[PDB]
Every structure is written in C-alpha cells, then in structure tokens.
Design a protein around this nucleic acid. Structure first.
Ligand SMILES: [Mg+2]
Ligand SMILES: [Mg+2]
Ligand SMILES: [Mg+2]
Ligand SMILES: [Mg+2]
Ligand SMILES: [Mg+2]
Ligand SMILES: [Mg+2]
Ligand SMILES: [Mg+2]
Ligand SMILES: [Mg+2]
Ligand SMILES: [Mg+2]
Ligand SMILES: [Mg+2]
Ligand SMILES: [Mg+2]
Ligand SMILES: [Mg+2]
Ligand SMILES: [Mg+2]
Ligand SMILES: [Mg+2]
Ligand SMILES: [Mg+2]
Ligand SMILES: [Mg+2]
Ligand SMILES: [Mg+2]
Ligand SMILES: [Mg+2]
Ligand SMILES: [Mg+2]
Ligand SMILES: [Mg+2]
Ligand SMILES: [Mg+2]
Ligand SMILES: [Mg+2]
Ligand SMILES: [Mg+2]
Ligand SMILES: [Mg+2]
Ligand SMILES: [Mg+2]
Ligand SMILES: [Mg+2]
Ligand SMILES: [Mg+2]
Ligand SMILES: [Mg+2]
Ligand SMILES: [Mg+2]
Ligand SMILES: [Mg+2]
Ligand SMILES: [Mg+2]
Ligand SMILES: [Mg+2]
Ligand SMILES: [Mg+2]
Ligand SMILES: [Mg+2]
Lengths: 233, 121, 52, 252
RNA sequence: UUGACAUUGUGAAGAGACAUAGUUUCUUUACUUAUUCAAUGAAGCGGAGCUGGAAUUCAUUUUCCACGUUCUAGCAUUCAAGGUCCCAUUCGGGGCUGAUCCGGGUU
RNA sequence: GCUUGUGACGGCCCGUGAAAAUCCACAGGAAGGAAUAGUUUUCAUGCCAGGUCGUACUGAUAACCGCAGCAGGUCUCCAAG
RNA sequence: GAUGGGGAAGCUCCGUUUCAAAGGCCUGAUUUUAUGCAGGCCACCAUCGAAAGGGAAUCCGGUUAAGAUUCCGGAACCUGG
C-alpha cells in the first residue's frame, strides 16, 4: 500500500523476459542416465517372453515384510560371533573332551546361488527367495521352473540388496531356508501358504502370458482419443 | 516427497572434492642445493682495454656472467659479493656465447677503487 | 582513453558520450508518447469488454 | 591418362569457396515457442551487401524471450523491406511483405521466399536474387501445403514449414551483359575458382574424353549415361533430349 | 545398379496349404522401440482444467474454436512488484501465491 | 612548384573492398556513505618497480643464390639545380 | 592441430565444438584457521600460425677504432604496484 506499488508482469509472448521455471523435464542428462532410462523403456516396448515377465510379479510389501521378519531370526554368524564360538570350543572340546560339540547345531539361512541350487535339486530347501534384479537375468531365470519341479515353494522378491542385508553381503541374488527352530515351524507354513498361492500355484498360467507391449503415454493418449471418437460418434 | 528442481537445462559435472597429495614416500631424498648462487652467477671480471675504460670513466664494472642469470640475479650478486650499491645493470650476449654485464654502481662508490680491491688492473 | 579524465569521455546529458542529443530528443518524445498511447489502448479496448 | 578437371574439383583444394568477406549464413529464426504459438517482433537494423551473393541481406534484431538481451538474425531481404521496418514472425502473424509465416497460414497465391523444406530447417527454397515460391493450395487433414518453386517444380511440404512474405531483392541482376572478361573475372573472384573454362576439346587425350584429334571434335556422342563413372561424365549428362529448344517451354 | 539372405520387431484387413477350424507364408496400411535424418546454451511437449464465447439445447450440456504483444527506429535484466505466512523482530532472510493440474517421451 | 601528408567532395562495381586481442562509454541501480564529521583516487602532487632473446656489418658488376670476387637473379624507404 | 569420440590389421585417418557429466571469477563466509562453503552469475571448449596485418609508452645534443631512438647528459612518457 504505502509508497508501495502493484506492478504485475505480463509473461505472454512478445513481452517480459520469461521467468525462472522448473525445466527438469528438459535437462540434457549425461549419456549414462539417458541409457539406463531408455533401457528400461525398450525393455517394455517389446513383447517380453513369458519366462521373463514372470518376474516383475514381485512379492507384496506386506507378506514380504513378514518374511524378512522371520528370515532375520535366522541370520548367519557374525565374524565376532564366530570368533567367540571358536574360542568356546577351541578352549573347550579339545580339553573338556567334546567332539567339536560344545557347539549347538546352527540354524541359518542358506545362500549363494550355486549352493541354493543343489539344495533345491536335493529337495532340502523349504522356502526360497529369488531376487527381481539380477542383471544377467539368466543366473536365476531357471529358478521358478526348478523349484516348481522339485516341488519346492519359492517367491520372487524385491531386493537383491535387501536379500544381501539379511546375510551380511552387499547383494545376494537368492536366500533360502532349509532348517527351522520348532518355535518357528508354525508361521513358516503360514508364509509358505500365501507365497505358494501367489507364485507356484500360478506358475503354469503365468507361463502362458507374455509381457511388455506397453506404449509410452504420448502414444497411449493418441489412441485412447482415436479409438474413442472413431467408434463413438 | 518428490524431485529436484533445476531451473537450467544444462547438466554440469558435479563439483566434487579434490584431496591434496599426501605421499607415502619422497620425490628425491635430498633437495637440490641452490643452482645459482652468487659465485656461479658472476663468473669472472672482463678486463679488456676498452672495458677498463668504462671502469675509470663510467663507474661501471664489466663482468662475464652466467648465461642462466637475469638482471635481478646479476644485480643482487654484485651487491652481495662486493659490498656495493648498483644503479642499473645492462647486459648483452657476447658473440662467443657468454654474457657481459655492464654494472653501474651508484655515485657513492668508485668502481676504479673497487676494481683494484677485487684485484685487477 | 584510459589516460584521460572522464570529462573527456562525456557530455553531461542522459546518454552522454553514447548517443547524440538529437537522438536523445527523439528517444524521450517517443518514449513519452508511446507510454501515453498505452494508456489510451488500455481504456479503449477496456470499454470494448463492456459494450460488444 | 590423368584425372580430369571435373574430378579434381571434389577434393576442394583450390576449389573451396572464397569466403573471408561474407556476412554470415542467411537463416530464419530458430522455430521456437514464440514463432509457433504466436508471433514475435523484430527490427531490420540494416540491409546490406553480401560478398558473392546477388541479393542483399537484412540484419533483423529481436528480443530474447528467455534472457535480457538482443539476438540478431541474418535474413535475406525481400524486395521492399527497409531499415526501421518492424518484422513479425509467427503462426499468428499478419500477411505483409517481410514477415515470416507458416505456409499453412497463408491463402493460395501468396508469394513467399526463403521457405523451409522441413519445418525448422531455417529456410532453404528460393533465396537467390529475384526468386520466390507460390502457394498453389493446401490440404488440412495431414497438414501439407503445396507450392511451385522457381524451377517450375511443384512440391508439397508441411504446413508448419515457414517462409517469408514477398520476393527476394536484387532482381534483374542477370539481364545486364557482363560485357568484358574482367567483370566475370571479379564475379568469380568472390565465389570460387571456376573461371575461365578450357574446352576439353582443346585438351590432349590424357586430360579429357574430348581431348586430341587432328581437328577439334568430340569424336563420340556427348550425351553421357547416368550410370557412367568418374572421368567419364563430361558433356551432357543423362540428357533426355538435346538440340535447340524450339517452341514454348513452361511447365504444363 | 539390380535381386536374395542377415540387421527385423508389433497390430489389422486381404490373398496363399493339411485339403470352409488357424500354426505358417507372402501383398497392402497401421504402430514405435531397432535403425535413419533435422533442430536447440534439449524452454514451454502431451493430457486434463479454468475462464470466455460462437454454437442449438430436444434434458442439461451433446460439442467446436479462441484462452495477455501490430499507428511510432523508445524502454523491458537484480529468484518480481503486489498479496499472504514464518524467523522472533535489525538489517537481513525464507516459504507460498503472483505463473492451475497431471505424465518426467528435449522437439 | 616538388614530394609526402590530411580534409570536404565526386566517379566506379552481377567487385561494395579482414579478424581478434585490447581500450573507453552509456543504460542499469546491487550496494556503500556525513555533521561532530563522513564519502571520494577517472583532479594535482608524491613512492617503488619494469625480466628474457635480437641489436656488429653486407645487402650486392666482391659479404645472398647461380661450383667463383660470374656482364645473370634477388622485396623496399629517402631523393637537389 | 591436441582432446570425449568414430574409422583403420596397423604405421595412423576423420572430426575442432564435434552425439562429452568438458570449466573460473568475484567476493562473501573466517576471527579454532586457514581457506572449507554460503549467493549469484559466465558457459566463451585447447593450442600454433604475421620481425610488412592489429598493437601501452622516448626524445633532442654529445660520445666510439668498431655500439647506440640501447651508453652519457638533459628532458619526457606507459604499464604494474
Ligand atoms: Mg543369530
Ligand atoms: Mg671517477
Ligand atoms: Mg639486450
Ligand atoms: Mg566533454
Ligand atoms: Mg570453406
Ligand atoms: Mg582460374
Ligand atoms: Mg572456353
Ligand atoms: Mg565452355
Ligand atoms: Mg592442343
Ligand atoms: Mg581418354
Ligand atoms: Mg568415350
Ligand atoms: Mg577429340
Ligand atoms: Mg569442333
Ligand atoms: Mg529442444
Ligand atoms: Mg610514393
Ligand atoms: Mg563504401
Ligand atoms: Mg570512446
Ligand atoms: Mg536485495
Ligand atoms: Mg590519478
Ligand atoms: Mg611475471
Ligand atoms: Mg646497425
Ligand atoms: Mg660490398
Ligand atoms: Mg656450394
Ligand atoms: Mg654477379
Ligand atoms: Mg586431427
Ligand atoms: Mg600466436
Ligand atoms: Mg606483429
Ligand atoms: Mg606487425
Ligand atoms: Mg646521436
Ligand atoms: Mg664504446
Ligand atoms: Mg655503425
Ligand atoms: Mg638516458
Ligand atoms: Mg631526470
Ligand atoms: Mg599509476
């Protein structure tokens, strides 16, 4: 009001320099970004064969949460835990007269790809988690088919990194349980039930369904509005 | 939450942290000593007859001087090796690949006197 | 020109050493007259919006 | 035998074009937001001779929609444009000599210059002294527009493709005889090294299909096939007829 | 230069055979991500919405356009003045609005 | 008068007759700045400093190129009665 | 003519701002303390290439066997601090 004045600017072609705006839609990204984006796109413009695309169907955040919860009560030793264990049997046993059996039967999650595979083949695993990342997808593509055949219940889960956490590596590709403390035998069958329902039970039909096909949304609208008017007068 | 908000469309290389060198060992074990002290700079006097005259008439001291050395280094070294004050220092390259310095002392000093107390005449 | 006092590099009207007075006469006149007719256009076309 | 003149031109040694003095490349404005939604004003600040061009350029300056500053384009002056004139460029611009409009925005019979082949290529058709193109119709669905270029060729382009209203300046330049060798001499001195021209028929065989013989003569038909090969194609390449054009030309 | 094969994928219509079910093959005409060409200091793309308003309503909106600049050889920049909310009132300074929403396909 | 310089003009061109470093100016008004004392070095005067390489002479009927102290060849300025 | 690049068996060839995450200034922030971060700009993208092109500033008298707009005398001027 006072000796203050309202001047409003006219930003409308032919006058007033355009103002600063958010051009993030328009920035010229480093070639490497451009690639990792278009790779994701190209991946879905194509029709993707049933044996891939059976991924993409990831476990849901609820069920999963309950699985990382159980799988956590089963981590493998820490370096300290192991250092500590050894000196409790190095010291004992050899002198106390045991059989390297002042150590209890350990119950941990089984991991490492080549490991888990033999487990499945040997019908020893009881719940397998496959990642959904795994860039040479091939490392893992044959796993649903496998588990299916070995009558072993599996689930494809978001997080190779997240698998990694529960086993002390950066990444982990797969994580599996074969063993379980009776205080847990229970709600594992519960977990194997939803999981088998979302994957193994579905597999035979998931196998018949290609993927991809998806248009970009400049092209999607182009024919949601073409195939609107052309039929609907 | 959501995305950044760049107002420019140019993406520039992130300004990232540049650590200074902290070597696990040394360049050369021992620093080189001074490659151009005053004794290497001002080589010997020039005592040609026609050079001598500048000394009697011009209060000027003619020296053969290191090729590697400039008017600053000539000036100071004459100053230091001889306890004298220099006005200005003209130089030239001889046609046998040596450098001649026409050193003019200030008026407090008397190049003649000063030349036969370096020893020549 | 960098060894010379700033008076050698101007006259004392608006746009001193830059443009030439007569040229600044024109600049002022036209500026005025145009800013004026802006007010005219505004109120004329304003009235359009009230009887059309 | 030796490589003939017309194959040597291609390595551009002494044949690159003499360029030191030229004003800059003649070009429309970049096809930006302003020019394709509305229009933007500029002023011709100068119309000026360009070395070895036949038609004057017009320097036209504009404001920069996105920064405080001027941006100066270099146009080819259409006949009648003038210093101080205002120039309007845009879809929603008006039909006057000097402005630049998308061939979709202008009625049939419009007469324009420096027209683009694809929208945005900043102008490619009819630039030379005197020439222009004419709109001879539009076709809205799939927005193409149809013009007749100076050659006589009819062609269709995008209706978004821009052009500038009127004809290019400096016309008639070729009705006046060169009169002497010297004026062609200076003429090419500011283009490229293509003057004067030795008749192949005055050369020896090493030099040219036409060279040699005890009288000067082409010795075989001078109408060469399309499918001929380098060092072969001299004379009338691919000529579908030949001889003095009796009768009215003009494209039917 | 001309053909074949490879780079080569996706729909739809039409022809071609086990001899009038759809695997496959060709011909047309669509698609867009391979490949190709132009542009720009990848700046305003596509989709919705606001207001207008021509339009005539066959129930109430079924639509289609526009949706800040043209007498003048001026001037147009300090995240923008305005409005509004904070800091703890210092001078400084921040958010929002001014400049509508959504999708990050630079066109 | 002679040579050279420079000006205001005029003729010519389908010929219209470089570039960059660098210097100044203007538009702008972020900001900073006094009365018990501030602002000012584009006004004057004052202080210190300015490295490196070339620098002789010939430049021609003998110092250059023509096997040479070769009647050849080899870019230019000054110019008296 | 280097450089991200693209060809080439390769010696190397192409491109020179080109399909590149291409870089440095003004001072503010410091009163551990010396230069980390807090603003904003600027996106101009190597470099070599003229002793006749562009270009900061010096003159007169005297002096040598042989140098001099370079030394001596006197009197200026430019650039940086
Ligand atoms: Mg444990
Ligand atoms: Mg004495
Ligand atoms: Mg010297
Ligand atoms: Mg004055
Ligand atoms: Mg060229
Ligand atoms: Mg010639
Ligand atoms: Mg001829
Ligand atoms: Mg001829
Ligand atoms: Mg002959
Ligand atoms: Mg021949
Ligand atoms: Mg022949
Ligand atoms: Mg012949
Ligand atoms: Mg003949
Ligand atoms: Mg763009
Ligand atoms: Mg002369
Ligand atoms: Mg002229
Ligand atoms: Mg000036
Ligand atoms: Mg402020
Ligand atoms: Mg001063
Ligand atoms: Mg220095
Ligand atoms: Mg001399
Ligand atoms: Mg001689
Ligand atoms: Mg010899
Ligand atoms: Mg001779
Ligand atoms: Mg190269
Ligand atoms: Mg150089
Ligand atoms: Mg020079
Ligand atoms: Mg020079
Ligand atoms: Mg003298
Ligand atoms: Mg002497
Ligand atoms: Mg001499
Ligand atoms: Mg002196
Ligand atoms: Mg003095
Ligand atoms: Mg000074």
């Amino acid at each position: 009001n006072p000796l203050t004045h309202s001047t409003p600017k006219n930003f409308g072609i032919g006058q007033a320099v355009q103002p600063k705006r958010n051009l993030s839609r328009y920035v010229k990204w480093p070639e490497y970004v451009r690639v990792q984006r278009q790779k994701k796109i190209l991946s879905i413009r194509l029709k993707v064969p049933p044996t891939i695309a059976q991924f993409q169907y990831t476990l849901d955040r609820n069920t999963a949460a309950e699985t990382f919860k159980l799988f956590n009560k089963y981590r493998p030793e820490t370096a300290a835990e192991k250092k500590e264990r050894l000196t409790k049997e190095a010291a004992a046993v050899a002198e106390a007269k045991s059989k390297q059996d002042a150590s209890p039967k350990p119950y941990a999650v089984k991991y490492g790809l080549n490991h888990v595979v033999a487990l499945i083949e040997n019908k020893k695993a009881k719940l397998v988690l496959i990642a959904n990342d795994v860039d040479p997808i091939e490392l893992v593509v044959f796993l649903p088919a496998l588990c299916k055949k070995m009558g072993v219940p599996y689930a494809i889960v978001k997080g190779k990194a997240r698998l990694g956490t529960l086993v002390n590596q950066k990444t982990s590709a797969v994580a599996a349980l074969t063993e379980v403390r009776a205080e847990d035998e229970a709600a594992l069958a519960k977990l194997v039930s939803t999981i088998d329902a979302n994957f193994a039970d579905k597999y035979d039909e998931v196998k018949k369904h290609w993927g991809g096909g998806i248009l970009g949304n400049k092209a999607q609208a182009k024919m949601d509005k073409r195939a609107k008017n052309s039929d609907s007068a | 939450k959501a995305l950044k908000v760049r107002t420019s469309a140019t993406f520039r290389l992130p300004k990232t942290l540049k650590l200074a060198r902290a070597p696990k060992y040394a360049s050369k074990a021992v620093p080189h000593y001074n490659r151009l002290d005053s004794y290497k700079v001002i080589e010997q006097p020039i005592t040609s007859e026609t050079a001598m005259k500048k000394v009697e008439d011009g209060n000027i001291l003619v020296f053969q001087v290191s090729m590697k050395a400039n008017k600053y280094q000539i000036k100071k070294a004459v100053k230091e090796l001889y306890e004298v004050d220099v006005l200005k220092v003209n130089t030239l390259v001889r046609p046998n690949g040596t450098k001649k310095a026409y050193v003019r002392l200030t008026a407090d000093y008397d190049a003649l006197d000063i030349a036969n107390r370096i020893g020549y005449i | 020109y960098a060894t010379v006092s700033k008076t050698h590099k101007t006259v004392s009207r608006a746009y001193g050493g830059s443009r030439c007075a007569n040229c600044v006469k024109e600049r002022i006149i036209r500026a005025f007259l145009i800013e004026e007719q802006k007010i005219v256009k505004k109120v004329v076309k304003e009235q359009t919006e009230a009887a059309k | 035998g030796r490589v003939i003149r017309n194959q040597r031109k291609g390595a551009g040694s002494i044949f690159t074009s003499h360029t030191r003095l030229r004003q800059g490349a003649a070009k429309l404005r970049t096809l930006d937001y302003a020019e394709r939604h509305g229009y933007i004003r500029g002023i011709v600040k100068q119309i000026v001779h360009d070395s070895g061009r036949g038609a004057p350029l017009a320097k036209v300056v504009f404001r920069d929609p996105y920064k405080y500053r001027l941006r100066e384009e270099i146009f080819i002056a259409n006949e009648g444009v003038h210093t101080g004139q205002f120039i309007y460029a845009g879809k929603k611009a008006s039909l006057n000599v000097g402005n630049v409009l998308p061939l979709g925005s202008v009625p049939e019979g419009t007469i324009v210059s420096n027209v683009e082949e694809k929208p945005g290529d900043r102008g490619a058709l009819a630039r030379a002294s005197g020439n222009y193109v004419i709109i001879i119709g539009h076709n809205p669905d799939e927005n193409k527009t149809r013009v007749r270029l100076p050659s006589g060729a009819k062609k269709v382009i995008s209706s978004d493709a821009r052009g500038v209203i009127g004809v290019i300046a400096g016309g008639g330049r070729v009705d006046k005889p060169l009169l002497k060798a010297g004026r062609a001499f200076h003429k090419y001195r500011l283009k490229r090294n293509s003057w004067p021209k030795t008749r192949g028929v005055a050369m020896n065989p090493v030099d040219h299909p036409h060279g040699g013989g005890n009288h000067q003569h082409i010795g075989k038909a001078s109408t060469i096939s399309r499918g001929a090969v380098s060092g072969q194609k001299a004379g009338l390449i691919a000529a579908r007829r030949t001889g003095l054009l009796r009768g009215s030309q003009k494209t039917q």
